[PDB]
């Protein structure tokens, strides 16, 4: 019963990287770049009312 909740929490916090953007811990080494792309059309910010 313990290892199951260890491995369904690892699954959950791997799914959490998909929905939000998770603070991983800051800049590791040299700033290499965005490594995955930059979208200039998408704005993922909450507008008011």
């Amino acid at each position: 019963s313990r290892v199951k909740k260890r491995k369904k929490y690892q699954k959950a916090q791997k799914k959490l990287k998909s929905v939000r953007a998770v603070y991983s811990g800051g800049q590791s080494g040299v700033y290499e770049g965005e490594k995955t792309g930059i979208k200039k059309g998408l704005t993922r910010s909450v507008k008011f009312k």
Binding site: R2, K5, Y9
Partner: protein, 171 residues
């Protein structure tokens, strides 16, 4: 302990998922037990707030409650007010257990390594080897959690796997 009111709502399921995964718990009964007695604690502190200043019950049971909460260690020394007992919650209580504390002090590499160290008796607070993971260490036993001297991660004689490998490599 006692089960909650609506035990199957999705906020409660993701709550218990985060709690059991972040603290290495085995089932729901750990959360439900520590939350049941926390419910008793702050249900009492609510009544101690609903009575007035200079009430004898409020004065004596309030400073008694916050001093034994500080000595359990869920409440810091400077917040000696009674509304912080209401601000208290469940992971403030199960950060105090020995599995969490062994991992935070760094004798283990995760909470699961801490749980198996505790159940394999390599961990002793003070004098006695503690061997159950949900122990609720206090503010004075916080700094004597160390490896047991009867254990190979302390300084003792190495266990059966190490000595059998040493003997077979000596053969």
């Amino acid at each position: 302990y006692s089960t909650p009111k609506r035990p199957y709502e999705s906020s409660r399921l993701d709550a218990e998922l985060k709690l059991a995964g972040e603290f290495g718990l085995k089932n729901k009964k750990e959360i439900y037990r520590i939350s049941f007695q926390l419910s008793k604690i702050r249900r009492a502190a609510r009544d101690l707030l609903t009575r007035d200043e200079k009430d004898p019950k409020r004065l004596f049971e309030g400073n008694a409650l916050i001093r034994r909460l500080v000595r359990v260690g869920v409440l810091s020394e400077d917040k000696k007010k009674l509304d912080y007992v209401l601000a208290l919650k469940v992971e403030d209580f199960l950060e105090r257990r020995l599995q969490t504390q062994v991992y935070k002090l760094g004798l283990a590499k995760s909470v699961h390594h801490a749980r198996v160290l505790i159940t394999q008796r390599h961990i002793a607070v003070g004098k006695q080897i503690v061997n159950i993971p949900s122990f609720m260490v206090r503010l004075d036993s916080e700094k004597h959690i160390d490896f047991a001297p009867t254990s190979p991660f302390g300084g003792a004689r190495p266990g059966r796997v190490a000595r059998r490998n040493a003997a077979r490599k000596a053969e």
